[PDB]
Amino acid sequence: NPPPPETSNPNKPKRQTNQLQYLLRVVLKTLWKHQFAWPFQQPVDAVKLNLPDYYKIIKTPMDMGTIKKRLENNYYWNAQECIQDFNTMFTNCYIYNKPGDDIVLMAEALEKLFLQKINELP
Numbered sequence: 377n378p379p380p381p382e383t384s385n386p387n388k389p390k391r392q393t394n395q396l397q398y399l400l401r402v403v404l405k406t407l408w409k410h411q412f413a414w415p416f417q418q419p420v421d422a423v424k425l426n427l428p429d430y431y432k433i434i435k436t437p438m439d440m441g442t443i444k445k446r447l448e449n450n451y452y453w454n455a456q457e458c459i460q461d462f463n464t465m466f467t468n469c470y471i472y473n474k475p476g477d478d479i480v481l482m483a484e485a486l487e488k489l490f491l492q493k494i495n496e497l498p
């Protein structure tokens with residue numbers, strides 16, 4: 377398993393905006409409780425899953441556990457940067473798997489809810 381993405385970085389400039397607080401308070405925390413959220417709450421554990429292929433395919437891994445910690449640590453400059461991590465998470469899933477796979481269906485459901493919630497930001 378590779379090291380998970382960084383959640384703090386003393387040399388990177390940080391910011392806290394209304395949009396970012398909303399991404400944590402509303403967008404992430406509602407997505408988290410969704411019945412299909414559990415696969416995406418931590419990095420893919422390829423060792424546990426016996427998927428030595430996953431990290432051969434996915435070069436920029438991302439997950440909501442990481443995003444959560446990054447929001448909690450004020451790691452982001454703006455909302456858009458955080459939104460890019462959500463979209464990287466979803467697109468990783470669609471790259472690695474095939475349409476109709478159970479995990480893809482799960483990601484699809486979360487992505488629509490995600491898009492619905494970010495449609496209007498503070």
Ligand SMILES: Cc1ccc(-n2nc(C(=O)N3CCN(C)CC3)nc2-c2ccc3c(c2)N(C2CCCC2)[C@H](C)C(=O)N3C)c(C)c1
Nearest residue numbers: 414415416420421424425427430468469470472473478479
């Ligand atoms: C349908 C399904 C949903 C989730 C999971 N599990 N289970 C754990 C686990 O070992 N966990 C998670 C929950 N926790 C409580 C115990 C540890 N991890 C995942 C998991 C997380 C993320 C992904 C995948 C699996 N798959 C795919 C791998 C083949 C099938 C789909 C690929 C990597 C995909 O791209 N991503 C995003 C499984 C076995 C089947």
